[model samples]
Target: LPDYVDWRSSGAVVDIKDQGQCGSCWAFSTIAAVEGINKIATGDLISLSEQELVDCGRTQNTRGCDGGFMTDGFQFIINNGGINTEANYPYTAEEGQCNLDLQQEKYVSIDTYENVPYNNEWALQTAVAYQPVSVALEAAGYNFQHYSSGIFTGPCGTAVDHAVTIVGYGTEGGIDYWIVKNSWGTTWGEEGYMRIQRNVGGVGQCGIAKKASYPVKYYN
Candidate 1:
């Protein structure tokens, strides 16, 4: 088992995105994981549509632009046959009418998704080593909001209400951390990324390991 991994270095991770006041972090998280896996499987780093999920991926557990779960977003893509490209569908950052025409322009799809074992950093690390993983964590605190750089050993709680993607992991000065990719623009954290404390028992630094998942894309 490798002790360190960074998908960004392999070009599996895409550019940073901004949710812009929309509680659509889950959509971004889901798409990022899909993009990562798709890039690894096909050597094509295509940006999928997060707006497609925001406007049309409503289920019993998800509400467009209000809040959502990554697994639900993944299911929507699977059930819809596929999802469109970001260049085709685009993001409005807010809930809007579902564009049935654009929704049919399937650009990519995932076979299925797997959830990492709850409260287990080892499992989360194992999954993330393969591909980017979608994770929910508490980001409403002042420290998280103002996070600048370095391994963030937060003083926050595990009341996870926000979603982000874990794109890589490594140790910094003997402190192990997960490289989290946020959707809050490049101005937040470390250029739209955060190195959160990893291996800290129980749900992780801020419930990161509590609800982690990743998409699976099989070769065609």
Candidate 2:
């Protein structure tokens, strides 16, 4: 693998977004991974809707704005035929009724998704080498909540609650790190991105490799 990989530099990433006070990080994480693969597959970088997932993507395991899983979100998109663009479905930060009218307009879709081997950072790294990946981590620390810059060596734990996208990875000053795209607006981290420490053994830093997964888009 190369020393660095950044989907943002390749135009596969969209602008940073804020999830507001909602527990919709999973929606953001899932959408970012799908957006990355879709862009790489079709050469068209389009922002998809998180609100669509937040409002419409309710399942046995996924509850909008109340925390959910990335895979469940991806499954919902696939079952729904596709998801709408962010411009059409715009985020409301809170759960609302599904827009049945807009829901029928399929904009972009993913064929399927796969998970990286649990507790394996190497597998997670390999998956990310191909496309951006959705990952979960413990984000309930003061340092994490107020994180501004630099490789986050966490005063955090591995309870895995918050979700984010791993958009790139590289070594900074001999310290390897994963460039994570967050959904807390541009005011947090490095323009809503975090460089978390990687290769820290089991489950990786804060369990980032614990539940890593990504969307797959095949040429049609």
Give the TM-scores of the predictions, in the order they appear: 0.98, 0.98
Query: Global CA lDDT of candidate 1, please?
Result: 0.93
User: How do the residues 54-104 of candidate 1 rate in per-residue lDDT, one tens digit apiece?
Assistant: 999998889998899999999998899999999999998889999999999
Q: Which stretches of candidate 1 lie over 4 Å from their true place?
A: none
- What's every prediction's RMSD, in angstroms? 1.0, 1.0
At residue 99, give the lDDT of candidate 2: 95
Clashing pairs in 1: none
- For model 2, give the 10-residue run with minimal summed lDDT: 211-220
Residue 163 miss distance in model 1 (angstroms)? 0.1
